[PDB]
Amino acid sequence: ARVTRIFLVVVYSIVCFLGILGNGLVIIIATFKMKKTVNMVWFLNLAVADFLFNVFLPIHITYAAMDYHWVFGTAMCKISNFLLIHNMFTSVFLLTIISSDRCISVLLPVWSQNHRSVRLAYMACMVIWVLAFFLSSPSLVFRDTANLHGKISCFNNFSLSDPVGYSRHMVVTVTRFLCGFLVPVLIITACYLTIVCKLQRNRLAKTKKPFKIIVTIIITFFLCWCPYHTLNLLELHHTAMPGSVFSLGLPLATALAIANSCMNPILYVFMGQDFKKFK
Amino acid sequence: IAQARKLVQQLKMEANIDRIKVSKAAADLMAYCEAHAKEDPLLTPVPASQNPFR
Amino acid sequence: YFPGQFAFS
Amino acid sequence: VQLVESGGGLVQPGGSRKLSCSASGFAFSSFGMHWVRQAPEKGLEWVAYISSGSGTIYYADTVKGRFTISRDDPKNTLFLQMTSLRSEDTAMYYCVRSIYYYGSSPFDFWGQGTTLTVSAADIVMTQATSSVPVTPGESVSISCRSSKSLLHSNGNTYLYWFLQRPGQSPQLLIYRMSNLASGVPDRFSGSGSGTAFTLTISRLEAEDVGVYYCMQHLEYPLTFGAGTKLEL
Amino acid sequence: TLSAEDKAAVERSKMIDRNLREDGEKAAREVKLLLLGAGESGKNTIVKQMKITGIVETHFTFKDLHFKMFDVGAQRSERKKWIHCFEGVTAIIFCVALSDYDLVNRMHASMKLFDSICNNKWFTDTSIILFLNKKDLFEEKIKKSPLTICYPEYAGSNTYEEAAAYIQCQFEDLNKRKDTKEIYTHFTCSTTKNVQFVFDAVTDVIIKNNLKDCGLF
Amino acid sequence: DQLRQEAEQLKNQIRDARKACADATLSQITNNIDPVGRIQMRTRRTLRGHLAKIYAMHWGTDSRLLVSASQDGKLIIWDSYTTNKVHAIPLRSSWVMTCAYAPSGNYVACGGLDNICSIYNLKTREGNVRVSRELAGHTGYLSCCRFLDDNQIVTSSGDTTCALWDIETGQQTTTFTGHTGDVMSLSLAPDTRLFVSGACDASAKLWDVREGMCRQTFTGHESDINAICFFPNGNAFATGSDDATCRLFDLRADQELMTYSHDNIICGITSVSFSKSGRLLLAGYDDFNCNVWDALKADRAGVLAGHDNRVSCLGVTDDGMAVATGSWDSFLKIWN
Ligand SMILES: CC(C)CCC[C@@H](C)[C@H]1CC[C@H]2[C@@H]3CC=C4C[C@@H](O)CC[C@]4(C)[C@H]3CC[C@]12C
Ligand SMILES: CCCCCCCCCCCCCCCC(=O)O
Ligand SMILES: CCCCCCCCCCCCCCCC(=O)O
C-alpha cells in the first residue's frame, strides 16, 4: 500500500497537468479564434468547467500524497470539496446538453435553424450552473475534520458532530447518484443512438469519424462515473460490507474519475475544424 | 466599319505625342523621392510622441 | 472509517 | 425638426407634475435629450439628461431624488416626473437634443418651453460683463472664464456659445469653442485658451440683440454662465 | 480617463455593434440558392412555380423555411470576375432545356457551362440541383427527330425513357468532385412538386452542414 | 476593299518610337542610391464588426475616419484612432464591391452587381443617413468609383466603359469607351484633370475628364489588371495584375519603367498603393499577406502578414501615418 500510493500520486499529477494544459488551450481558441455560434458557447463553458476543476484538484492530490492526512484546516476542506463537486457536476450536465443539441439539430433541421440562437445557449448555461451549485451545496454543510490516533481526516459527518446521519446520507447519495449519472447516461445514449440510426438510414456519413467519436463518448462516460458512483452507493452499508475494498477501491475510482476532464478537449473541440487550422 | 475609328484614334493624336528620354524621367522621379523623403512616416518611423496610433 | 474519506464526496 | 412641450401650469408646493416633450421631424431614438430650466429674470441651468437607449442618466445635485426622467422611443416622447415641488422650481423648462459622435454638434435644437409657477466641485463659469450697450456696424467681444481648464488630453476644449433672442429660445452658435454651428452666419467667431474664452462678432445687425451664455461640457454637472446682454 | 463626450461615443458604438450582431443572426436563418442556366432554358418557369438590371433576388417560404434565390443571368460580363461572391451559397440550381438538343449545339454549350460551374474552386462542396425542362416537348420531338444525330456515339433505343436516362447520366458523370458534393437530378413537371424537391435537397444539405460544424463529421 | 494593315503599321511605328526613346533604364540610374532598410510595421488597431468578406475601403481626407464596405450589406464608418463606429449604413443590395469617400466628407458612395451607384448623404438635419442619389445607366457591374467634388463622380463598370456623372441631375455628363474587357481599376490624378483606368484586356488607358477621349494606352501585363494607383507627383502610375507582377509606367516617356515581381510569388495582386513620398509601393496579394517594395530598386523590404484570407483592399492616409488593410476574413487592420 505504500508502494502503490506513490504511483497513484504520479498518475494523478500527470492527468491533472494534461487536463489543465488542454482545457486552457481551448479557453483561448474559444475566446479569440471563434465565431458567435451556439456550439462555441457549450465548448467554452465546458472548458471553463474543466479548467477550474484541475486547479483546485492539487489540494486533494497532496492531501492524498500524505497518508490521507488533512493539513489545510476545516474551512479549506469544507469549500474546496464543494468546488470540485460543483465543477464535476457542471461538466456532466454540459455533456448532456451537447448531445441533446446535436440530436435536435440532426432530427429537426428546419426547426433548429429558426430557433437556435446564442441567447438561448447562455440562458441554458446559466441554468446548468445554478443546478450544479444547488446539487453540490451539501458538501459545505457536512464536510468536517476530525482527529483520531494521531491522524486527522476531512470527511462527511451527517450527524453534525445510528439513525441520525443515515437518512441524510441516503437521500444525498441517492440524489447525487441519479442526477449525476443515471439520467445523463440515458439521455446521451438515447440521443447518440438516434443520431446513428438516422445517419445510417439516410446514408449521409461518408467517413467512420462520426460513428467512432460517438462510441467513444458513451463508453468513457460510463466507466468513470459508474466506478465512482457505485463505490459511493455501496458505502451506505459499510457496517456490513468489509472496509478492505474502500481503502483501495475508492482511490482507483477517483483515478478513473479525473481522467474524464482531460480527454474532453481532444474529443469535442480538437475534433473540429477550428483546431484543424492550428494543427 | 469600326476599323476606321481605331485607325484615326491611334493616328490623329496617339502617334503625335512628344516623348521625353527615359533617363530624364527616371532622374525626375528619383529627385522627387529624395526631396520629400524627410516627411515620410513610413520610411522614417516617428517617435511615440508624434504617433497618433500609440 | 467514516463515510466521505479517501474521496471527494 | 420640431420640439413642442406641454404640461406646465400652476402647482401647489409639495405636489407632483409631469412634463411631456413631443418630437417630430428627426430620428428621436438616435438623440440624447436634456432638460434645461430658466427661472424668470435669471439665467438658465441644467436639470437632467438621458442618453440614447436610456443607458446613462444624470441629474443635477439640486434636483436629484425629487425628479426622474424617462423617454418613450416608440412614439417619440420625453417625460419628466417631478415630486415634492419647491418654490425654487418656478421656471421655463426647455427640451434640448444632443447627438454624440466624432464631429457632431450637441445642443443644436431647443424647444419653445413650458411655463411652470409654483405658488408660495462644479466648474463655475464667470461672465463679469452683463450689459454691453452697443450699436450696429462695429465689433463687440464677449468674454468668459472657467475655474478649471476645459482643455482635454484629446485636444478638444469643450465650450459652447448660445444666443437667446428676446421672447425666443436659445440657439447654438459655436460648439467646442472653434466650430461654427450649421445655419449660423459667418460673422461670428470664437477662440481662446485653456482657461480664457472670447466670442467676437465682426459685423452686427439688428437681429443680434439678446443674451449670450457660456457652457461647459468637460464634466457632467454642466454649468452655464451668468449671461451678457447686448442692448441696441 | 475619457471625457464626457468621449463616453457617449463609446455608448453609440456599442449600440451600433449590438444592432449589427442582431442583424447578423437574422440573415443566417435564410437559405441562399444560386440560380443558373443557359438562357431560354426555363429558368423563368422554375421561378414562377416556386413563388406562390443586374441581379434579381426572390424570397419565398415553404414549410417554415426561408429561401432567397439570386438570378444573375442578366449580367453580360466575365463570370470569372464575380463568381467568388457566391462562395457561401447553400446550393446551386442549374436549369437545362431537354428540347434544345436539336437547335443551334446548344446542348453542348449547356454541358460546357455545367462542367465549368461544377468544377470551380469555389464550389468544391456546394451541392447542385439539376432541372431538366421541356419534357413533353422532348417526347414530342424525339419521336420525329432521332437523338443519334445530336450524339453520333449514342447506342440504344429511340424511346423517351432510355434517352432521358442517357442525358441524365451524361450530365451527371461530368463532375470530378464525386466525394464532397451531390447532384439531385429532377425532370420538372407542370406541378407544387419542384419546391418539394428543392426542400428535400436543402434539408439534406442543412443536416450535412450541421453535422460538419458541430464536430461529428 | 477596306484594309487594316495601316493599324499594324501605326502600332509598329509607335513601338519603334518608344524603343528609340529608351536611352537607359530606371534600374541603371538608381544603382548608387542607398537601399531602404528593413521595414518593420506593427499592427496598432484591429477594426472588428464586419460579419462577411470586406470588398473595399477608403480613407477620409482628414486621415482619421475611414469607410468600409462588406458583403453583408453594410457600410461602416470607423474612427480609426479609437476604433469607434461613427455610422453603420444598411445597403439595399448586399452585393457591393466598391466604396468611396468624398473629399469634403459630406457624402459616401457605393456600388456593385446591381449596376447602380448609390450616393449617401452624411450631413442631414435628422440624425440618420439617407440615400441622396441613385445613378443608373451602366449595363455591367460597378468596379470602382472616385469623387471629383460634391457634384461630379467618375465610375467604371464591367461593361468596358467609364462614366462621368453630374450628381445633381443624375445624368452621365461624359462617357469613356475603348476598352475591350471589363474595367477593374480606376485612379484619379492629384490635380483631377486626367485619370487612369486598368481593364481585363491587360491594358491601362489615360483619359481626359474635361475633353473626354483617351490620350495614351499602356500595355505590358500578360493578364487582367486588378488594381491601379497614381504616383504622388502625377507623372507615373503603378499597376497590378493576376500574373504576380506589379509594373511602373511613366506618362512622359510613354513606356514601362520597372517590374516588381519575385520568383516565389505566383498569386495575383488585388491592391496597389504608394507612400506619401512615393518611395515605397504597397501591394496586397492572394497569399494572405501584403508586401512592401522599394519603388526605386524593385527589392522587397517587408511583409505584412496579419491576415488569414485574401487581402482585398489597401489604403494609405494622406499624411502617410498609417496603412489600412482589409481582407476576406472580415477584419481591417491598421499598420504603423
Ligand atoms: C481510454 C480508455 C479508458 C478506453 C478507450 C476506448 C476507445 C479509445 C476505444 C474502445 C473501442 C474502440 C473501437 C473499437 C472498434 C473499432 C473498429 C476498428 O475497425 C477501428 C477502430 C475502432 C472504431 C475502435 C476505436 C477506439 C475505441 C473507440
Ligand atoms: C430543466 C432543468 C435541466 C435543463 C437545463 C437547461 C434547459 C434549457 C431549455 C431550453 C429550451 C429552449 C426552447 C426554445 C423554444 C422556442 O424558442 O420556441
Ligand atoms: C439530471 C440531468 C439533467 C440534464 C440537463 C441537460 C439539458 C437537458 C435538456 C436539453 C434541452 C434541449 C437542448 C438545448 C437546445 C437549444 O440550445 O435550443
PDB file of N, CA and C in Angstrom, chain A residues 221-246:
ATOM      1  N   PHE A 221     -17.784   7.790 -20.591  1.00  0.00           N
ATOM      2  CA  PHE A 221     -18.633   8.366 -19.527  1.00  0.00           C
ATOM      3  C   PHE A 221     -18.985   7.214 -18.622  1.00  0.00           C
ATOM      4  N   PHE A 222     -19.533   6.170 -19.218  1.00  0.00           N
ATOM      5  CA  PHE A 222     -19.986   5.051 -18.375  1.00  0.00           C
ATOM      6  C   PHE A 222     -18.880   4.657 -17.415  1.00  0.00           C
ATOM      7  N   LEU A 223     -17.707   4.286 -17.898  1.00  0.00           N
ATOM      8  CA  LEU A 223     -16.734   3.700 -16.942  1.00  0.00           C
ATOM      9  C   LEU A 223     -16.372   4.638 -15.791  1.00  0.00           C
ATOM     10  N   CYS A 224     -16.015   5.876 -16.091  1.00  0.00           N
ATOM     11  CA  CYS A 224     -15.537   6.668 -14.944  1.00  0.00           C
ATOM     12  C   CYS A 224     -16.651   6.850 -13.923  1.00  0.00           C
ATOM     13  N   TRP A 225     -17.781   7.281 -14.462  1.00  0.00           N
ATOM     14  CA  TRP A 225     -18.799   7.655 -13.463  1.00  0.00           C
ATOM     15  C   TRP A 225     -19.283   6.414 -12.756  1.00  0.00           C
ATOM     16  N   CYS A 226     -19.455   5.320 -13.473  1.00  0.00           N
ATOM     17  CA  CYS A 226     -20.043   4.148 -12.814  1.00  0.00           C
ATOM     18  C   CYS A 226     -19.102   3.716 -11.705  1.00  0.00           C
ATOM     19  N   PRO A 227     -17.778   3.518 -11.861  1.00  0.00           N
ATOM     20  CA  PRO A 227     -17.000   3.229 -10.662  1.00  0.00           C
ATOM     21  C   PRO A 227     -17.105   4.268  -9.546  1.00  0.00           C
ATOM     22  N   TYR A 228     -16.977   5.558  -9.860  1.00  0.00           N
ATOM     23  CA  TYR A 228     -17.003   6.470  -8.686  1.00  0.00           C
ATOM     24  C   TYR A 228     -18.346   6.378  -7.960  1.00  0.00           C
ATOM     25  N   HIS A 229     -19.457   6.406  -8.691  1.00  0.00           N
ATOM     26  CA  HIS A 229     -20.803   6.418  -8.057  1.00  0.00           C
ATOM     27  C   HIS A 229     -21.115   5.095  -7.360  1.00  0.00           C
ATOM     28  N   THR A 230     -20.738   3.975  -7.968  1.00  0.00           N
ATOM     29  CA  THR A 230     -21.169   2.690  -7.374  1.00  0.00           C
ATOM     30  C   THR A 230     -20.374   2.510  -6.093  1.00  0.00           C
ATOM     31  N   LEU A 231     -19.078   2.806  -6.136  1.00  0.00           N
ATOM     32  CA  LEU A 231     -18.402   2.599  -4.834  1.00  0.00           C
ATOM     33  C   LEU A 231     -19.052   3.514  -3.795  1.00  0.00           C
ATOM     34  N   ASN A 232     -19.400   4.761  -4.134  1.00  0.00           N
ATOM     35  CA  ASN A 232     -20.108   5.568  -3.093  1.00  0.00           C
ATOM     36  C   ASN A 232     -21.420   4.877  -2.659  1.00  0.00           C
ATOM     37  N   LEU A 233     -22.370   4.610  -3.566  1.00  0.00           N
ATOM     38  CA  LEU A 233     -23.629   3.965  -3.209  1.00  0.00           C
ATOM     39  C   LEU A 233     -23.407   2.772  -2.287  1.00  0.00           C
ATOM     40  N   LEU A 234     -22.324   2.021  -2.498  1.00  0.00           N
ATOM     41  CA  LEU A 234     -22.050   0.852  -1.669  1.00  0.00           C
ATOM     42  C   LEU A 234     -21.599   1.240  -0.267  1.00  0.00           C
ATOM     43  N   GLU A 235     -21.029   2.436  -0.105  1.00  0.00           N
ATOM     44  CA  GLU A 235     -20.572   2.860   1.214  1.00  0.00           C
ATOM     45  C   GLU A 235     -21.716   3.085   2.194  1.00  0.00           C
ATOM     46  N   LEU A 236     -22.964   3.107   1.719  1.00  0.00           N
ATOM     47  CA  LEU A 236     -24.102   3.226   2.625  1.00  0.00           C
ATOM     48  C   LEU A 236     -24.189   2.040   3.577  1.00  0.00           C
ATOM     49  N   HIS A 237     -23.635   0.894   3.190  1.00  0.00           N
ATOM     50  CA  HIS A 237     -23.646  -0.314   4.006  1.00  0.00           C
ATOM     51  C   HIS A 237     -22.237  -0.710   4.433  1.00  0.00           C
ATOM     52  N   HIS A 238     -21.429   0.278   4.827  1.00  0.00           N
ATOM     53  CA  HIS A 238     -20.070  -0.005   5.275  1.00  0.00           C
ATOM     54  C   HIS A 238     -20.039  -0.778   6.586  1.00  0.00           C
ATOM     55  N   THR A 239     -21.125  -0.744   7.363  1.00  0.00           N
ATOM     56  CA  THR A 239     -21.177  -1.527   8.593  1.00  0.00           C
ATOM     57  C   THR A 239     -21.130  -3.021   8.298  1.00  0.00           C
ATOM     58  N   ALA A 240     -21.839  -3.460   7.259  1.00  0.00           N
ATOM     59  CA  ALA A 240     -21.862  -4.867   6.877  1.00  0.00           C
ATOM     60  C   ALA A 240     -20.767  -5.202   5.870  1.00  0.00           C
ATOM     61  N   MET A 241     -20.610  -4.376   4.841  1.00  0.00           N
ATOM     62  CA  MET A 241     -19.575  -4.618   3.849  1.00  0.00           C
ATOM     63  C   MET A 241     -18.194  -4.422   4.469  1.00  0.00           C
ATOM     64  N   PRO A 242     -17.207  -5.225   4.079  1.00  0.00           N
ATOM     65  CA  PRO A 242     -15.860  -5.056   4.632  1.00  0.00           C
ATOM     66  C   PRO A 242     -15.235  -3.742   4.191  1.00  0.00           C
ATOM     67  N   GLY A 243     -14.358  -3.216   5.042  1.00  0.00           N
ATOM     68  CA  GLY A 243     -13.655  -1.983   4.758  1.00  0.00           C
ATOM     69  C   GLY A 243     -12.416  -2.117   3.907  1.00  0.00           C
ATOM     70  N   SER A 244     -12.020  -3.345   3.560  1.00  0.00           N
ATOM     71  CA  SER A 244     -10.820  -3.536   2.752  1.00  0.00           C
ATOM     72  C   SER A 244     -10.995  -2.990   1.340  1.00  0.00           C
ATOM     73  N   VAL A 245     -12.200  -3.108   0.774  1.00  0.00           N
ATOM     74  CA  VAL A 245     -12.445  -2.605  -0.572  1.00  0.00           C
ATOM     75  C   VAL A 245     -12.375  -1.084  -0.629  1.00  0.00           C
ATOM     76  N   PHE A 246     -12.867  -0.396   0.400  1.00  0.00           N
ATOM     77  CA  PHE A 246     -12.929   1.061   0.410  1.00  0.00           C
ATOM     78  C   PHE A 246     -11.551   1.711   0.429  1.00  0.00           C
TER      79      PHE A 246
END
